[PDB]
Design a protein around this motif. Structure first.
Motif, PDB file in Angstrom:
ATOM      1  N   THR A 211       0.858  -1.185   0.000  1.00 16.63           N
ATOM      2  CA  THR A 211       0.000   0.000   0.000  1.00 16.63           C
ATOM      3  C   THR A 211       0.911   1.259   0.000  1.00 16.63           C
ATOM      4  O   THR A 211       2.143   1.127   0.074  1.00 16.63           O
TER       5      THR A 211
ATOM      6  N   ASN B  42       1.193   3.070   2.480  1.00 13.93           N
ATOM      7  CA  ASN B  42       1.760   2.984   3.830  1.00 13.93           C
ATOM      8  C   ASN B  42       2.785   1.884   3.920  1.00 13.93           C
ATOM      9  O   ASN B  42       3.285   1.625   5.018  1.00 13.93           O
TER      10      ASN B  42
ATOM     11  N   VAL C 139      -3.885   3.827  -0.585  1.00 14.85           N
ATOM     12  CA  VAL C 139      -4.157   3.480   0.817  1.00 14.85           C
ATOM     13  C   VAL C 139      -2.974   4.027   1.613  1.00 14.85           C
ATOM     14  O   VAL C 139      -1.932   3.375   1.665  1.00 14.85           O
ATOM     15  N   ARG C 140      -3.103   5.232   2.179  1.00 17.82           N
ATOM     16  CA  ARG C 140      -1.997   5.822   2.930  1.00 17.82           C
ATOM     17  C   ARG C 140      -2.443   6.675   4.093  1.00 17.82           C
ATOM     18  O   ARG C 140      -3.616   7.049   4.156  1.00 17.82           O
TER      19      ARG C 140
ATOM     20  N   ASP D 141      -2.224   8.056   8.454  1.00 17.47           N
ATOM     21  CA  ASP D 141      -2.612   7.699   9.822  1.00 17.47           C
ATOM     22  C   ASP D 141      -3.902   6.852   9.876  1.00 17.47           C
ATOM     23  O   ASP D 141      -4.891   7.185   9.205  1.00 17.47           O
TER      24      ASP D 141
ATOM     25  N   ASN E 238      -4.927   4.395   8.412  1.00 21.11           N
ATOM     26  CA  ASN E 238      -5.226   3.705   7.152  1.00 21.11           C
ATOM     27  C   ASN E 238      -4.343   2.483   6.981  1.00 21.11           C
ATOM     28  O   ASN E 238      -3.259   2.528   6.382  1.00 21.11           O
TER      29      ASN E 238
ATOM     30  N   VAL F 120      -5.033  -2.107   7.085  1.00 21.52           N
ATOM     31  CA  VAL F 120      -5.914  -3.256   6.911  1.00 21.52           C
ATOM     32  C   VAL F 120      -5.570  -4.321   7.980  1.00 21.52           C
ATOM     33  O   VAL F 120      -4.416  -4.758   8.051  1.00 21.52           O
TER      34      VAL F 120
ATOM     35  N   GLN G  78     -11.823  -4.895   2.623  1.00 21.16           N
ATOM     36  CA  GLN G  78     -11.241  -3.869   3.481  1.00 21.16           C
ATOM     37  C   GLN G  78     -10.797  -2.659   2.662  1.00 21.16           C
ATOM     38  O   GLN G  78     -10.988  -1.530   3.111  1.00 21.16           O
TER      39      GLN G  78
ATOM     40  N   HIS H 206     -12.472   1.174   3.014  1.00 23.79           N
ATOM     41  CA  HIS H 206     -11.532   2.290   3.045  1.00 23.79           C
ATOM     42  C   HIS H 206     -11.905   3.403   2.024  1.00 23.79           C
ATOM     43  O   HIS H 206     -12.017   4.572   2.399  1.00 23.79           O
ATOM     44  N   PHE H 207     -12.115   3.031   0.763  1.00 19.12           N
ATOM     45  CA  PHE H 207     -12.419   3.981  -0.305  1.00 19.12           C
ATOM     46  C   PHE H 207     -13.881   4.464  -0.304  1.00 19.12           C
ATOM     47  O   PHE H 207     -14.136   5.598  -0.707  1.00 19.12           O
TER      48      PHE H 207
ATOM     49  N   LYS I 176     -15.450   5.311   2.459  1.00 18.01           N
ATOM     50  CA  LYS I 176     -15.386   6.375   3.482  1.00 18.01           C
ATOM     51  C   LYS I 176     -14.943   7.704   2.884  1.00 18.01           C
ATOM     52  O   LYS I 176     -15.529   8.731   3.204  1.00 18.01           O
ATOM     53  N   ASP I 177     -13.909   7.680   2.020  1.00 19.36           N
ATOM     54  CA  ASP I 177     -13.341   8.834   1.318  1.00 19.36           C
ATOM     55  C   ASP I 177     -12.518   8.360   0.111  1.00 19.36           C
ATOM     56  O   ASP I 177     -11.469   7.740   0.269  1.00 19.36           O
TER      57      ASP I 177
END
Length: 163
Positions: free
Chosen positions: A26, A28, A94-95, A97, A99, A101, A113, A117-118, A120-121
């Motif tokens: 990701t 992250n 996917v990056r 704080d 964020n 899985v 998952q 994540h996507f 939500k925003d």
């Protein structure tokens, strides 16, 4: 071979695929194990408020023509399509704080998952997807990462059709 994902019924209309379990990084730099479908495929995506034609190669969305009730309905179908495509830019989006899985339970789905994540925003998703200049094709409009219709620019491979 009709399956369900993110509230959409997917139905393959062309192509074939084999599965390969693969590891991905990701934004992250977190390792996720995903089940990758290798092979060029075409699908119809049928939902209650949107429908689409999705053309995709291995971990790469070639084209998505979306039709729906409104902007929110259409964005919802775009997010599902982008997560389903398994594209590196979707995974790299996917990056930051919190964020992350939860992969401590290996039976859980990283695709579901990524979707949560996507959902939500999708701001990071849409801005990191990349944009492109678009052709003539009247009746089909481009859509910018903020979901503004455009006749000159669109999110790479994404087109909006009139319902």
């Amino acid at each position: 071979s009709s399956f369900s994902f993110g509230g959409f019924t997917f139905k393959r209309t062309s192509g074939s695929s084999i599965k390969r379990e693969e590891e991905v990084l990701t934004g992250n730099l977190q390792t996720l194990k995903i089940r990758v479908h290798e092979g060029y495929e075409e699908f119809t995506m049928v939902g209650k408020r949107a429908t689409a034609i999705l053309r995709k190669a291995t971990r790469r969305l070639v084209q998505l023509i979306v039709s729906g009730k409104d902007e929110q309905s259409i964005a919802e179908a775009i997010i599902v399509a982008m997560v389903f495509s398994q594209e590196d830019c979707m995974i790299k989006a996917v990056r930051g704080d919190l964020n992350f899985v939860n992969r401590a339970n290996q039976r859980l789905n990283p695709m579901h998952q990524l979707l949560r994540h996507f959902q939500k925003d999708a701001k990071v998703l849409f801005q990191n997807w990349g944009i492109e200049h678009i052709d003539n094709v009247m009746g089909m409009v481009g859509v910018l990462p903020d979901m503004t219709p455009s006749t000159e620019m669109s999110m790479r491979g994404i087109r909006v059709s009139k319902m």
